[PDB]
Amino acid sequence: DNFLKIERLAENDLPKFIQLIRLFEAVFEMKNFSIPDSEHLQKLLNQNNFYVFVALLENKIVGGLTSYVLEQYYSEKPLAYIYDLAVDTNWQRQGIGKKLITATNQFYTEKGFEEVFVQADKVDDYALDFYRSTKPTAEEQVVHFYYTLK
Amino acid sequence: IDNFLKIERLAENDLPKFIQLIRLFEAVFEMKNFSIPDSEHLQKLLNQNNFYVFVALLENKIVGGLTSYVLEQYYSEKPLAYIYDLAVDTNWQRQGIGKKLITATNQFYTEKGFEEVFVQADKVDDYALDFYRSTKPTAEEQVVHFYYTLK
Numbered sequence A: 001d002n003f004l005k006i007e008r009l010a011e012n013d014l015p016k017f018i019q020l021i022r023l024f025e026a027v028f029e030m031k032n033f034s035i036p037d038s039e040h041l042q043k044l045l046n047q048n049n050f051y052v053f054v055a056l057l058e059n060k061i062v063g064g065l066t067s068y069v070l071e072q073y074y075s076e077k078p079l080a081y082i083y084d085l086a087v088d089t090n091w092q093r094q095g096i097g098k099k100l101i102t103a104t105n106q107f108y109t110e111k112g113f114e115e116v117f118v119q120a121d122k123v124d125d126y127a128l129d130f131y132r133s134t135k136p137t138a139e140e141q142v143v144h145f146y147y148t149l150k
Numbered sequence B: 001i002d003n004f005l006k007i008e009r010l011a012e013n014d015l016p017k018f019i020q021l022i023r024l025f026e027a028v029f030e031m032k033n034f035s036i037p038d039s040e041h042l043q044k045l046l047n048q049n050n051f052y053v054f055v056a057l058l059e060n061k062i063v064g065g066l067t068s069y070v071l072e073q074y075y076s077e078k079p080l081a082y083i084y085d086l087a088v089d090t091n092w093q094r095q096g097i098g099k100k101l102i103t104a105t106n107q108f109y110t111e112k113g114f115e116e117v118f119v120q121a122d123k124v125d126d127y128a129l130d131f132y133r134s135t136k137p138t139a140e141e142q143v144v145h146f147y148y149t150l151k
């Protein structure tokens, strides 16, 4: 356990960001994925409203998550939106996912955020079991609609 | 009322209309004990390059609106848009305002070259589901939403 480190990426961590994206690509089984150019990814990493957390063994990325800050108009305290979370399939069920969620909520707690939220597909049984083990404050059944643009 | 209804995307000198919309949200969502954040905060939010508000106007009266957040992607150079809140004044519902707000919002992000816009509704909110389904979305997915209320 001493071996696992959690790191919040900084603006000079593009190589680690790209490792994480490649982990996403593999774990989510994305086919024919063409990674965006590094200038785009750098600009994203530079944003003050986006935070990436990774899990490291040595400097091998074995999991991570991405999150977005949503400034509120209902409150001065912001919300954080955990977008993606994944752990290397060889390293799953070792407490890594849990440590990532803990660190993430700890970070936004110290930043004085109101809440953090995250979502899973109703079909995704393994994800559901995971989030339900993280002592979330609550869960809600929602319907997600999207419009694919021209 | 189509001839008189106007959709406006708020700009940075539109804080009065932003506040009017928040007051509409408070009414429509029937929020209790709401203390609106100070104007310095709301102004800073309005000034962000990742936040866009559309309002529906009957003359100078806000009768609906929606807020949306930009989410730049790492899977694509094309960003996503997240519609967070949408409401129409109760006196003016079921007259096509909600549809015109969605339409305007998707047209805008289409001009901006976004990949996709998404919006959510609670599964028990049958009337909201009815509404979104009438706007002809590309697809809908069942999702479970978890949150962590921070200390």
Ligand SMILES: CC(C)(COP(=O)(O)OP(=O)(O)OC[C@@H]1O[C@@H](n2cnc3c(N)ncnc32)[C@H](O)[C@H]1OP(=O)(O)O)[C@@H](O)C(=O)NCCC(=O)NCCS
Pocket: B028, B084, B085, B086, B087, B088, B089, B092, B093, B094, B095, B096, B097, B098, B099, B100, B121, B126, B127, B128, B130, B131, B134
């Ligand atoms: C939908 C809403 C957001 C604004 O949209 P609107 O102006 O009322 O809706 P529109 O007039 O543009 O048209 C949508 C119609 O809603 C649906 N609808 C019609 N009557 C309805 C009713 N009594 N209840 C629910 N949906 C109804 C129709 O399916 C649809 O048009 P259709 O005739 O083609 O089937 C509004 O009703 C509202 O603010 N409700 C309370 C707040 C809310 O739920 N917001 C969304 C979640 S944040």
Ligand SMILES: CC(C)(COP(=O)(O)OP(=O)(O)OC[C@H]1O[C@@H](n2cnc3c(N)ncnc32)[C@H](O)[C@@H]1OP(=O)(O)O)[C@@H](O)C(=O)NCCC(=O)NCCS
Pocket: A027, A028, A083, A084, A085, A086, A087, A088, A091, A092, A093, A094, A095, A096, A097, A098, A099, A120, A124, A126, A127, A129, A130, A131, A133
């Ligand atoms: C969940 C995930 C994201 C990372 O989690 P992880 O490091 O493997 O999970 P943890 O080891 O921290 O598990 C914590 C708890 O999840 C729960 N859990 C139950 N079933 C599980 C399963 N099939 N997989 C993972 N966690 C499970 C356990 O209670 C577990 O505690 P325990 O081992 O003491 O019983 C990882 O499984 C994953 O990447 N899955 C594929 C991608 C994905 O679905 N991501 C979420 C959607 S974006």
Ligand SMILES: [Cl-]
Pocket: A018, A022
């Ligand atoms: Cl690479």
Ligand SMILES: [Mg+2]
Pocket: A007, A008, A009, A010, A012, A013
């Ligand atoms: Mg670093």
Ligand SMILES: [Mg+2]
Pocket: A133
């Ligand atoms: Mg367990």
Ligand SMILES: [Mg+2]
Pocket: B008, B009, B010, B011, B013, B014
């Ligand atoms: Mg204006």
